[PDB]
């Protein structure tokens, strides 16, 4: 009714927004009850990059992880997937928007990482950019470990190894069930006849430099058999030498 | 009367750590105490401010909260688990927490019996 004209006006504001102080009606959006209708009136597909960055900042600042979850699932990730496919790179404002979305890790993991790696259509450039965005942000140990376990459980793609390796690069202490799952994953590549990219080999490598102190003898020989069956002229001797130069417990 | 109070306390802290019922520090420990969603209060005896101890005692007396006193705060940070560990489990992050507030309990048969026994002996 009468609020529709105001929200149409701020919709027209957001279509040409570059900077400045936002209208105060936008800053009280997560306090509303029927917020999805208001968001559909504001037309998020027509927002600019800085306006969407400030929208992500507003929704991340106002708690309520489920609303941020549905906002990241419905609005932010389709815009990122559209923007990478067009300009072959991510904008500065949207990069800062995903950083401000990693200001809340719980809504980000279930909202941006897991749907992208579960869709199966994630390209290389999206995977590299997003994994660098995780790499930039300091992350909780339990959250990163659960993301590790979930990525290790799902089906393999060329993108998934990039996230797996870049989460290994954080070098935190890992829960042992997660180590069991990733060992089961790499042993799931024991009998695969598909040719593997260099990213899988590098991910396994960085796993062997970092977590060689927490490898039991059985899985040590299992990864040795994995190196035997799936060799590489350069990286396989490195993993093999790092395996013979490891102390357990 | 089998296992001690100073191990049942870490068991209660752990069961709160899984169940997400710990108000640590100063500000979450105080405002959730006044919301009547909190249960227990633990204060470090090693303190730099005395009216801090007076305020903690006043909060405990106002809402009949049982007060537990531990010697120093760095050991309390060791008890709670506010330390960053290695792969082996070596802490490098030594941060001490002063006000430790227990909101929710884990359903225990050993630590709970001991802490209610100590509370009944105290009161």
């Amino acid at each position: 009714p009468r609020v529709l004209e105001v929200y149409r006006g701020v919709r027209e504001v957001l279509s040409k927004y570059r900077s400045g102080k936002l209208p105060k009606a936008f800053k009280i959006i997560p306090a509303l009850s029927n917020w999805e209708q208001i968001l559909y009136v504001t037309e998020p597909e027509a927002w600019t990059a800085a306006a969407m960055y400030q929208a992500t900042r507003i929704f991340a600042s106002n708690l309520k992880e489920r609303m941020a979850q549905r906002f990241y699932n419905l609005v932010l990730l389709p815009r990122v997937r559209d923007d990478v496919a067009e300009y072959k790179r991510l904008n500065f404002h949207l990069y800062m928007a995903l950083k401000k979305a990693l200001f809340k890790p719980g809504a980000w993991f279930k909202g941006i990482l897991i749907p992208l790696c579960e869709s199966g259509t994630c390209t290389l450039r999206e995977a590299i950019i997003v994994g660098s965005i995780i790499t930039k942000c300091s992350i909780p140990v339990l959250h990163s470990s659960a993301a590790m376990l979930k990525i290790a459980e799902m089906e393999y793609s060329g993108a998934n190894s990039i996230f797996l390796r870049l989460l290994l690069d954080k070098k935190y202490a890992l829960p042992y069930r997660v180590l069991d799952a990733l060992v089961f994953h790499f042993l799931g590549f024991r009998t695969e006849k598909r040719e593997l990219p260099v990213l899988w080999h590098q991910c396994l490598l960085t796993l062997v430099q970092r977590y060689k102190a927490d490898l039991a003898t059985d899985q040590k020989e299992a990864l040795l058999e994995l190196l035997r069956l799936q060799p590489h002229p350069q990286l396989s001797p490195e993993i093999r030498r790092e395996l013979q130069s490891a102390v357990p417990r | 009367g089998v296992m001690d109070v100073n191990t049942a306390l870490q068991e209660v802290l752990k069961t709160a750590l899984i169940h997400d019922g710990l108000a640590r520090g100063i500000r979450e420990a105080a405002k959730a105490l006044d919301k009547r969603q909190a249960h227990l209060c633990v204060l470090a005896s090693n303190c730099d401010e005395p009216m801090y101890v007076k305020l903690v005692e006043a909060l405990c007396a106002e809402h009949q909260i049982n007060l537990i006193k531990v010697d120093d705060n760095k050991k309390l940070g060791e008890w709670v688990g506010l330390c960053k560990i290695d792969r082996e489990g070596k802490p490098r992050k030594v941060v001490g927490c002063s006000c430790v507030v227990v909101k929710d309990y884990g359903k225990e048969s050993q630590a709970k019996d001991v802490i209610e026994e100590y509370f009944k002996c105290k009161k």
């Binding site: 339990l142 470990s145 659960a146 376990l149 202490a173 829960p175 042992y176 069930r177 180590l179 069991d180 799952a181 060992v183 089961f184 927490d214 039991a216 059985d218 899985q219 417990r249 | 750590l17 899984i18 688990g81 560990i85 489990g89």
Partner: peptide, 18 residues
Amino acid sequence: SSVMRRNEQLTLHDERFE
């Protein structure tokens, strides 16, 4: 749930996934 297990030397935290 896998088969091989970490066996020895301590579990610091239970970890929450549920």
